[PDB]
Structure 1
Amino acid sequence: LIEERLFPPPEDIVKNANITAYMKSKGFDDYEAFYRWSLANRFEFWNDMAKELHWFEPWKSTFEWTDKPFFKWFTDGKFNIAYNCLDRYMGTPIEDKVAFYWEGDDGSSRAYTYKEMYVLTNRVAKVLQNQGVKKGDRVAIYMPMIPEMAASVLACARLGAPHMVVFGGFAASSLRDRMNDCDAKVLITADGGYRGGKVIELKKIADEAVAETPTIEKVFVQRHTGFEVPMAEGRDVYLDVLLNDIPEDTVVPCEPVDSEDMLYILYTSGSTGKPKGVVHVHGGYAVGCYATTKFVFDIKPSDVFWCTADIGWVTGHSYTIYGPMMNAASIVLFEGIPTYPAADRFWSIVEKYKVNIIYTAPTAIRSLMRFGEELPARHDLSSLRILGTVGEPINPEAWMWYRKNIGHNELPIMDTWWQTETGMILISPTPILPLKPGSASRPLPTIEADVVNKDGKPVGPEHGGFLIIRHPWPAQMRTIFGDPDRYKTYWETIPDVYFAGDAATMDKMGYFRIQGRVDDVIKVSGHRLGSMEIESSLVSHPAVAEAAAIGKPDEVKGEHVKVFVILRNGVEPTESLAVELKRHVRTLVGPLATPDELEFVTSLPKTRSGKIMRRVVRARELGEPV
């Protein structure tokens, strides 16, 4: 009943939307006609968008294949994303506007204006530079959500050094593996982060990782907790000590890089394989992140914007730092979690900072729904004008809850669909679209998405199929680091199209619904975890011969991990050992990957080629749909 219902957009928002302005300026009133035009005129649309940023030198052609299916955008243009996040705002009123409203886990708080971030980024760049960091070099970051994490990212961008950010929830193997796949030259971390009152021993975990990461010349340590931590003489150095000798007036000018020079690497996972280092570049990524933020979140000069995701995920790259700073937004940045001190913390934040736009996980909403409707009702949420969803599809129940309690039965929900590989939002509502619960809606401009069968034949309205994109978009990944074959499979699994890796349905009105990952990859709390990362840390234990991880349904988190373990012969299968192997995974991969269920088994299903058939395992437990 509820999913099949259309919710029209509220008072004043359609007339004043940014997308309506761009539409009007090409002679369109209706999104549908505009959409069709954007398909024909994709290069022109993206030229318009990129013209709105500062370029050091302009580009020869909007798009071209290189050695198909590798490609390029804004060819020969020279650019620095960091410059459109900071430099160009200097000498303007926007220099004194707030860039980050930082909010610590304990309620401490500090606001940084764009000028203050410009200066802080310049000084961090100089510290990196003085160490020998230069264009091309991979800088690893393992940090809590604090200003110096933003400044560190932007400082890498301004040197032309690709950053590689590891979420702070990951433990030592995870951090080590990522740093070695990309041959990282230095590491920026902290003494620790705070999360729900407890200290997270970032530096001690970094120590366990760096000792098996031979490429690391130096570790920069932000002093955040203030706790005595180990500091290896020579390698490890406090950032604040170094910054003592870097004047306030210090300036590292942005390095003008090619529109296709690496901006960053961010590791994500399939259900098989070691993690994939997804590569994004400065030009196309900036333009895509900029345009989608502008249109989807409708950013205006008076807006305070809050995306609740960690910068350790693509969500926070694209829609905390890069995208929103290029619209000159005031951006909330929160160190902590939704439940500490208590489960109204998000609503305190919205109220504290008069937040206008919120973009959050449906995990978070399922989490807070448990604690009832009283908590949001205690706070003034009346500053919100746009809500949003990211990381997975949202059930209609939680959609209603979000709209009812957080949006007073009026506000729009931007239900978004994209992935690390896509770099930017691809399918999503805009303020001008009637909404349907649990629907990403219509594609964004130029994005030629469809639903096809194995062979790439359109399946037609109302039928479930593979969700493909037909033509590149600016912010798409260019490759997988050290491994181009792995990038190619995205284009060569179904002839001539990009294979998103999700199944989907498109209804009579063109609205897409996402039905989850095809590879049945384990997603926990919105995040892809590799079966292989889990299974390895289990086999590395002395007790364990083999392992297979699957994901099983979880009311709150999406799925949780269950693992099936074949022990060595002779080992007694105890609850004590179950607890021990859970501990093992926690201390190596991290809390988010730690199995909630575990079962000792004597055998596992294999191909005759010898690999674990994980689909069979899951189908034994849960059955396979036809």
Structure 2
Amino acid sequence: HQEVPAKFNFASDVLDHWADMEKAGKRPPSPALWWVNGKGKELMWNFRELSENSQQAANVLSGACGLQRGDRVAVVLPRVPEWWLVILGCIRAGLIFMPGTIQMKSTDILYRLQMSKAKAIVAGDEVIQEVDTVASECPSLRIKLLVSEKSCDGWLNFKKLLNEASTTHHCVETGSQEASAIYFTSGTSGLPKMAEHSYSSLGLKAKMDAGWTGLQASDIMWTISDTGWILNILCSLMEPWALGACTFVHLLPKFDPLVILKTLSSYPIKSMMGAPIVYRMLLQQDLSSYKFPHLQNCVTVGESLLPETLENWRAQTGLDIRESYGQTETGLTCMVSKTMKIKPGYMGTAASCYDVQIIDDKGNVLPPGTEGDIGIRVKPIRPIGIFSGYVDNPDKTAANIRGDFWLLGDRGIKDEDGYFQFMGRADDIINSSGYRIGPSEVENALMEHPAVVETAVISSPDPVRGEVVKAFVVLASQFLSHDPEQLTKELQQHVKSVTAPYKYPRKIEFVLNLPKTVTGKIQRAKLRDKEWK
């Protein structure tokens, strides 16, 4: 059981507080969301406007579209203000939001809509055609909202409908444990499962963690995230808005480091968060021309921060990078908070709620200096912030609980001051550049190509990028004498076309055999260890 209030809602209990402060004069109109596209277009909302505009959103969803409390809404949008508006709208109307990346292809979308039985989808120009290819095969799908300068035949015009909606919406009295969002998350085999989070697991947690990033009421944070990542909800949205701070969003259509750098230099961003890869790319640029004295807090998550990266960032910029850790299922688990001593190679100590420990094969807590499995105590009291379980899959929610602990699937060592040292995934999940990729997803993709009679996909160290997807392939006999550079390029594009590109094998190595079990199952462990020295 849990020690929460009966009811909770981030929109009413947190965001509307900051709005009411402005309305009542107790605070000046303070910036809440500052958006830019990099082509001279910018837009900005104070908290009051954000409230009003997001009520319009909830009216559009529950009014004009008649979506009902508990209905599941897929959201597939680029970095545009409407995403933040749609998410707030869902929270207000009691609608379950299910973000996914705009990189998604049509099969990805079919899987997700069918498994979730989504009643609606909010999408942008990038994925309209892909949705439309498979939409008819999704019986539950009743509402298609498009966010776009163009109108389209079969899709409701979201922007038009928002302008017509009323700026008053009565927030649903949502329960603490009531489903708020479903994030699809990759597994060690098979296809993505549905991680369910409550109104309190996200919102209340985020309110209790408010400030962990060093951010403060009158500052600006720039989280750099794919809108389909849980990072975007916890860091880009809830963290700053729990504090009354401003959140910065750049469209960043092309993930260009020079663009990131100009933006840091040109705008008064005080805190920035982003996956390690971002900092590594920025260090390859000319930091001395593009300076940013205003920047105080740099945080990082979704990958192991290398001591080399940390050290250089210090050298070049005079700032520390503070590492943080977690997963879709647990949210912010560990971190180096602002006032903590930094220890290179360590990701910090337990987040406030959580009692985190290295546990053994039986489920018992281990001493410092001993490698084991990183876990969070969840019995008898599940702490605020833990998710509600995998949807329709109590079995697989259970398979991750050992004794009184939720297992994260990560190995680690804890030091004398309680700092965790990440020691690798215990299973086959791969972590590239902030994305979390299941191998069966990439393997299936390859297997649709006729040159691939057999394949096995693992993680692999790149000395520039970090952890990158590698594919071992077994070529059909009738492909052996091909140019391996071109074949590889071909195979890569094949993946880029059939599922989201972020999971495309950045390395491919051809072989005649693949090690297996004496039962037939492929030995990815054996291939990973050889790869990682």
TM-score by length of 1: 0.78
Look up the match of 1:499. 407
Q: 1:348 aligns with which of 232, 245, 262?
A: 262
Residues 269 and 530 of structure 1 are in contact (CA less than 8 Å); yes or no, is this contact kept in structure 2? yes
Q: How does 1:259-270 map to 2 (within 5 A)?
A: 259-270=176-187
Look up the match of 1:445. 352
Partner deviation per Cα, 1:159-191 (whole Å, 9 max, x = no partner): 111110001233332232222221111111111
Look up the match of 1:33. none
Q: 2:275 aligns with which of 361, 366, 375?
A: 361
Letter in structure 2 aligned against 1:622: E
In the alignment, structure 1 residue 281 sits paired with structure 2 residue 198: yes
Residues 187 and 218 of structure 1 are in contact (CA less than 8 Å); yes or no, is this contact kept in structure 2? yes
Q: 2:423 aligns with which of 507, 515, 525?
A: 515
Find the aligned partners of 1:582 and 1:298 in 2 and give their Cα distance. 40
Q: What is the CA distance between 1:244 and its match in structure 2?
A: 4.7
Q: 2:248 aligns with which of 312, 316, 332?
A: 332
In the alignment, structure 1 residue 487 sits paired with structure 2 residue 397: yes
Q: 1:150 aligns with which of 84, 108, 118?
A: 84
Letter in structure 2 aligned against 1:87: D
Find the aligned partners of 2:481 and 2:238 in 1 and give their Cα distance. 49
Find the aligned partners of 1:579 and 1:347 in 2 and give their Cα distance. 30
Find the aligned partners of 2:278 and 2:454 in 1 and give their Cα distance. 34
Find the aligned partners of 2:453 and 2:35 in 1 and give their Cα distance. 47
Going from structure 1 to structure 2, the CA distance change for 1:600 and 1:440 (only over 3 Å counts) comes to closer
Letter in structure 2 aligned against 1:297: T
Superposed CA RMSD in Å reads 2.4
Residues 73 and 284 of structure 1 are in contact (CA less than 8 Å); yes or no, is this contact kept in structure 2? no
In the alignment, structure 1 residue 169 sits paired with structure 2 residue 99: no
* More off after superposition, 213-222 vs 144-153: 213-222
In the alignment, structure 1 residue 558 sits paired with structure 2 residue 466: yes
Going from structure 1 to structure 2, the CA distance change for 1:586 and 1:488 (only over 3 Å counts) comes to same
Look up the match of 1:418. 326
Residues 189 and 428 of structure 2 are in contact (CA less than 8 Å); yes or no, is this contact kept in structure 1? no
In the alignment, structure 1 residue 123 sits paired with structure 2 residue 56: yes
Find the aligned partners of 1:379 and 1:596 in 2 and give their Cα distance. 31
Letter in structure 2 aligned against 1:132: G
Partner deviation per Cα, 1:219-266 (whole Å, 9 max, x = no partner): 211115x5xx8x4x3x323222333533xx432211111111111011
Letter in structure 1 aligned against 2:455: A
Look up the match of 1:615. 525
Q: How does 1:213-224 map to 2 (within 5 A)?
A: 213-223=138-148
Letter in structure 2 aligned against 1:353: Y
Look up the match of 1:114. 47
Residues 142 and 165 of structure 1 are in contact (CA less than 8 Å); yes or no, is this contact kept in structure 2? yes
Find the aligned partners of 2:246 and 2:532 in 1 and give their Cα distance. 48
Letter in structure 2 aligned against 1:398: T
Residues 460 and 532 of structure 2 are in contact (CA less than 8 Å); yes or no, is this contact kept in structure 1? no
Q: 2:175 aligns with which of 225, 246, 258?
A: 258
Q: How does 1:50-89 map to 2 (within 5 A)?
A: 64=1, 72-74=2-4, 77-89=6-18
Letter in structure 2 aligned against 1:219: K
Aligned length: 523
Q: Could you tell me the percent identity over the aligned residues?
A: 27
Q: What is the CA distance between 1:600 and its match in structure 2?
A: 4.4
Look up the match of 1:389. 300
Find the aligned partners of 1:402 and 1:256 in 2 and give their Cα distance. 46
Find the aligned partners of 1:377 and 1:337 in 2 and give their Cα distance. 25
Find the aligned partners of 1:446 and 1:79 in 2 and give their Cα distance. 17
Look up the match of 1:138. 72
Structure 2: gaps of 5 or more residues:
none
Find the aligned partners of 1:82 and 1:573 in 2 and give their Cα distance. 61
SS of 2:108's equivalent in the other structure is helix
SS of 1:266's equivalent in the other structure is strand
Q: What is the CA distance between 1:566 and its match in structure 2?
A: 3.6
Q: What is the CA distance between 1:289 and its match in structure 2?
A: 1.4
Going from structure 1 to structure 2, the CA distance change for 1:418 and 1:253 (only over 3 Å counts) comes to same
Find the aligned partners of 2:167 and 2:61 in 1 and give their Cα distance. 13
Q: What is the CA distance between 1:601 and its match in structure 2?
A: 4.2
Q: What is the CA distance between 1:107 and its match in structure 2?
A: 4.2
Residues 310 and 320 of structure 2 are in contact (CA less than 8 Å); yes or no, is this contact kept in structure 1? no
Q: What is the CA distance between 1:570 and its match in structure 2?
A: 4.8
Letter in structure 1 aligned against 2:441: E
Residues 84 and 326 of structure 1 are in contact (CA less than 8 Å); yes or no, is this contact kept in structure 2? no
Q: What is the CA distance between 1:304 and its match in structure 2?
A: 1.1
Residues 293 and 319 of structure 1 are in contact (CA less than 8 Å); yes or no, is this contact kept in structure 2? no
Look up the match of 1:34. none
Q: 2:164 aligns with which of 245, 253, 264?
A: 245
Structure 1: gaps of 5 or more residues:
1-63, 65-71, 192-200
SS of 2:54's equivalent in the other structure is helix
SS of 2:329's equivalent in the other structure is helix
Letter in structure 1 aligned against 2:404: D
Find the aligned partners of 1:585 and 1:432 in 2 and give their Cα distance. 44
Find the aligned partners of 2:228 and 2:433 in 1 and give their Cα distance. 14
Going from structure 1 to structure 2, the CA distance change for 1:623 and 1:310 (only over 3 Å counts) comes to closer
Look up the match of 2:116. 182
Look up the match of 1:401. 312
Residues 222 and 238 of structure 1 are in contact (CA less than 8 Å); yes or no, is this contact kept in structure 2? yes
In the alignment, structure 1 residue 584 sits paired with structure 2 residue 494: yes
Q: What is the CA distance between 1:404 and its match in structure 2?
A: 3.0
Partner deviation per Cα, 1:342-396 (whole Å, 9 max, x = no partner): x34333323433111111211111122222xxx3323342212222111112111
Find the aligned partners of 1:143 and 1:521 in 2 and give their Cα distance. 26
Look up the match of 2:155. 236
Look up the match of 1:532. 440
Q: What is the CA distance between 1:569 and its match in structure 2?
A: 6.1
Letter in structure 1 aligned against 2:406: Y
SS of 1:258's equivalent in the other structure is coil
Residues 214 and 338 of structure 2 are in contact (CA less than 8 Å); yes or no, is this contact kept in structure 1? yes
Letter in structure 2 aligned against 1:463: T
Letter in structure 2 aligned against 1:515: M
Greater RCO, 1 or 2 (C-alpha within 8 Å, sep 6+):
1
TM-score by length of 2: 0.91
SS of 2:325's equivalent in the other structure is coil
SS of 2:109's equivalent in the other structure is helix
Find the aligned partners of 2:462 and 2:198 in 1 and give their Cα distance. 36
SS of 1:421's equivalent in the other structure is coil
Going from structure 1 to structure 2, the CA distance change for 1:504 and 1:175 (only over 3 Å counts) comes to same
Going from structure 1 to structure 2, the CA distance change for 1:89 and 1:95 (only over 3 Å counts) comes to farther
Q: What is the CA distance between 1:542 and its match in structure 2?
A: 4.4
Find the aligned partners of 2:349 and 2:160 in 1 and give their Cα distance. 51
